[PDB]
Amino acid sequence: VADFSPSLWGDQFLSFSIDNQVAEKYAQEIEALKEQTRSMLLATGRKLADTLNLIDIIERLGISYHFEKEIDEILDQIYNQNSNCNDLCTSALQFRLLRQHGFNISPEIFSKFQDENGKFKESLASDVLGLLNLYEASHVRTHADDILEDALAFSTIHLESAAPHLKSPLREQVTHALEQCLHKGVPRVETRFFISSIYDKEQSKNNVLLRFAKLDFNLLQMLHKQELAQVSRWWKDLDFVTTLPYARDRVVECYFWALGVYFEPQYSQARVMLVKTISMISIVDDTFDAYGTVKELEAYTDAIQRWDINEIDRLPDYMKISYKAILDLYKDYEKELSSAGRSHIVCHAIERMKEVVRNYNVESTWFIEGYTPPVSEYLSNALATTTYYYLATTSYLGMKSATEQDFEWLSKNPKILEASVIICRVIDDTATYEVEKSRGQIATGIECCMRDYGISTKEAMAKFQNMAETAWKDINEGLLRPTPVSTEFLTPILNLARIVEVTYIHNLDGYTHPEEVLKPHIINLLVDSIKI
Numbered sequence: 001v002a003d004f005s006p007s008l009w010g011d012q013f014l015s016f017s018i019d020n021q022v023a024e025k026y027a028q029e030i031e032a033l034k035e036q037t038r039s040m041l042l043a044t045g046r047k048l049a050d051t052l053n054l055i056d057i058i059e060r061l062g063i064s065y066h067f068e069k070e071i072d073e074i075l076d077q078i079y080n081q082n083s084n085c086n087d088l089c090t091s092a093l094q095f096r097l098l099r100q101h102g103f104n105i106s107p108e109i110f111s112k113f114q115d116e117n118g119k120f121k122e123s124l125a126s127d128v129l130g131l132l133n134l135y136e137a138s139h140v141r142t143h144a145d146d147i148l149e150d151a152l153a154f155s156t157i158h159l160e161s162a163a164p165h166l167k168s169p170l171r172e173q174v175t176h177a178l179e180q181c182l183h184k185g186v187p188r189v190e191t192r193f194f195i196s197s198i199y200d201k202e203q204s205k206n207n208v209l210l211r212f213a214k215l216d217f218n219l220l221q222m223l224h225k226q227e228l229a230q231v232s233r234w235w236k237d238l239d240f241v242t243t244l245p246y247a248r249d250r251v252v253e254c255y256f257w258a259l260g261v262y263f264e265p266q267y268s269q270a271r272v273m274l275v276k277t278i279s280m281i282s283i284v285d286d287t288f289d290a291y292g293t294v295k296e297l298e299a300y301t302d303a304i305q306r307w308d309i310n311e312i313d314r315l316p317d318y319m320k321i322s323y324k325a326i327l328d329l330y331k332d333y334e335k336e337l338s339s340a341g342r343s344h345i346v347c348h349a350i351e352r353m354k355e356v357v358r359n360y361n362v363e364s365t366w367f368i369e370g371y372t373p374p375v376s377e378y379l380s381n382a383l384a385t386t387t388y389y390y391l392a393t394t395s396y397l398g399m400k401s402a403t404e405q406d407f408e409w410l411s412k413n414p415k416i417l418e419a420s421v422i423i424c425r426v427i428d429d430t431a432t433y434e435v436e437k438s439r440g441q442i443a444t445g446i447e448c449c450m451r452d453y454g455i456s457t458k459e460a461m462a463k464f465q466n467m468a469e470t471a472w473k474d475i476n477e478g479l480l481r482p483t484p485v486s487t488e489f490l491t492p493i494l495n496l497a498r499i500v501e502v503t504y505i506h507n508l509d510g511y512t513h514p515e516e517v518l519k520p521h522i523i524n525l526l527v528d529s530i531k532i
């Protein structure tokens with residue numbers, strides 16, 4: 001029965017008229033602050049620590065997307081010079097920034113901070129700025145970085161101990177880091193927090209950078225607001241709120257998801273297309289889970305595979321609405337890309353959609369039979385039901401630079417994509433185990449793991465956590481140069497992994513239950529603008 005809570009928002013987003021006067025004002029001053037900030041990056045005689053801090057600040061402020069070349073060449077130069085700025089803070093920052101950019105900098109730089117036993121000198125426990133940067137850096141480690149195996153536990157215990165007596169805004173920056181690291185967090189979300197809660201309150205803040213950050217964030221927010229309005233109208237013209245009452249109305253939440261994948265203005269068309277897909281597949285998921293019967297679902301799955309409007313008659317009236325909306329959406333996609341001549345790539349997203357549906361069917365079949373497959377079998381089916389292979393393929397649709405070779409690479413299920421999918425699965429299964437078990441779904445991850453290995457619930461979740469950790473180290477390795485495809489195409493995958501982490505931060509389904517997790521984010525990103 002129904003159960004799902006209605007949209008918290010309402011028509012709050014259908015309407016958005018951009019005051020073109022304020023937009024142009026912001027744009028004009030931004031361009032000036034842009035070159036001022038560019039000149040700052042091009043400064044000659046700056047120290048390593050100062051240069052790393054500048055780059056770090058510009059990134060955290062969310063304005064680094066304007067200087068991808070400038071920042072790259074500086075980090076490239078820093079990578080090849082191998083200068084030993086000897087302190088922990090500068091070292092950890094140097095490590096993180098280079099790694100996040102693909103530069104495979106050796107982790108032995110952390111040797112000078114460890115004793116002959118390989119552990120961190122407990123004497124560094126009084127260096128907060130060093131401990132903090134080390135904490136952030138501990139989240140970007142790969143499988144070849146065992147030198148940092150105790151870095152997270154080290155920095156954490158000492159950061160928690162020192163936190164209560166630190167001056168603001170440092171105290172808040174640390175408290176926030178311990179709750180959410182920079183690397184595994186959503187870009188806009190972390191930027192919003194840095195700009196308003198940290199940098200603005202920083203005594204040594206650079207006013208030009210703060211002004212730039214605030215204006216830019218607010219200007220882009222106007223675009224996000226426009227996009228969300230366009231997708232809200234599109235969502236109402238479908239009126240699935242009344243025709244398909246069993247489904248979830250989370251179009252705003254789906255926009256947040258697409259905004260987490262990419263926020264840059266150039267990805268406007270991409271975000272819009274992606275929001276429509278997530279929203280659409282959410283219904284298909286809602287159909288197989290809380291509505292359709294064994295027969296109906298089998299007819300639906302088969303209909304999707306054929307991908308022809310003629311098969312609509314075999315489907316009951318309510319499924320006819322879903323089925324047609326889906327084909328039309330893809331016809332719209334083909335039409336949007338008709339201009340550039342990138343219509344020939346829509347099929348990739350479709351083949352992935354069919355895959356998701358096949359597994360949705362298998363998932364229900366297992367539920368009916370009361371099947372509890374071994375972990376091996378479970379994953380071979382449950383990985384696609386996360387829809388991550390699908391969403392990742394979709395994100396490329398609007399990306400004007402995406403070629404055939406990029407989709408070709410993605411179809412082979414790369415390790416980075418594979419890792420991203422695993423994280424989404426493991427995290428969802430750890431959070432939703434108990435709830436799904438109460439509904440009779442004994443085919444869930446933790447359950448399969450428990451009976452397959454003969455371990456308790458605690459051990460099963462603990463092992464799943466290790467799978468996510470491994471997946472994270474795998475994602476970190478995928479970013480390292482030479483990348484199989486352009487970095488532009490690896491970020492969406494990375495972001496997808498970031499969104500799950502952030503959504504299930506309180507170990508609860510954030511999409512189905514937005515209010516506690518997603519609500520604040522949506523308010524801070526799509527409602528309230530950073531007050532200047």
Ligand SMILES: CC(C)=CCC/C(C)=C/CC/C(C)=C/[C@H](O)P(=O)(O)O
Nearest residue numbers: 282285385386387424428509511512
């Ligand atoms: C709650 C949802 C739909 C969030 C959408 C974003 C998403 C990738 C979340 C993780 C995987 C899914 C798809 C869970 C399903 O809902 P389920 O466990 O019901 O198959």
Ligand SMILES: [Mg+2]
Nearest residue numbers: 285286289290
């Ligand atoms: Mg569901």
Ligand SMILES: [Mg+2]
Nearest residue numbers: 285288289360
């Ligand atoms: Mg489902």
Ligand SMILES: [Mg+2]
Nearest residue numbers: 428429432436
């Ligand atoms: Mg689940």
